[PDB]
Structure 1
Amino acid sequence: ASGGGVPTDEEQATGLEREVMLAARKGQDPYNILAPKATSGTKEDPNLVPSITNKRIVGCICEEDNSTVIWFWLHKGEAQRCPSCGTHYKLVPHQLAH
Structure 2
Amino acid sequence: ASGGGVPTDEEQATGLEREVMLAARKGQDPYNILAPKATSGTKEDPNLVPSITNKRIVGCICEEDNSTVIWFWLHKGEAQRCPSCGTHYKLVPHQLAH
- TM-score above 0.5, yes or no: yes
Q: Normalising TM by the smaller chain, what interval?
A: over 0.9
Separation in structure 1 between the aligned mates of residue 16 and residue 44 of structure 2, nearest angstrom? 36
Question: Runs of 4 or more off by more than 4 Å in structure 1?
Answer: none
Query: 5+ unaligned residues in a row in structure 2: which ranges?
Result: none
Q: CA deviation at 1:95?
A: 4.9
Deviations 1:6-37 (A, max 9, x none): 00000000000000000000000100000000
- Counterpart CA distance in 2 for 1:95 and 1:26 is 14
- Cα displacement (A) at 1:70: 0.2
Number of aligned residues: 98
Deviation of the 1:64 alpha carbon? 0.1
For the structure 1 residues 24 and 41, does the alpha-carbon distance in structure 2 shift closer, same or farther, using more than 3 Å as the test?
Answer: same
Normalised to the residue count of structure 1, the TM-score between the two structures is: 0.95
TM-score normalised by L of structure 2: 0.95
% same residue: 100
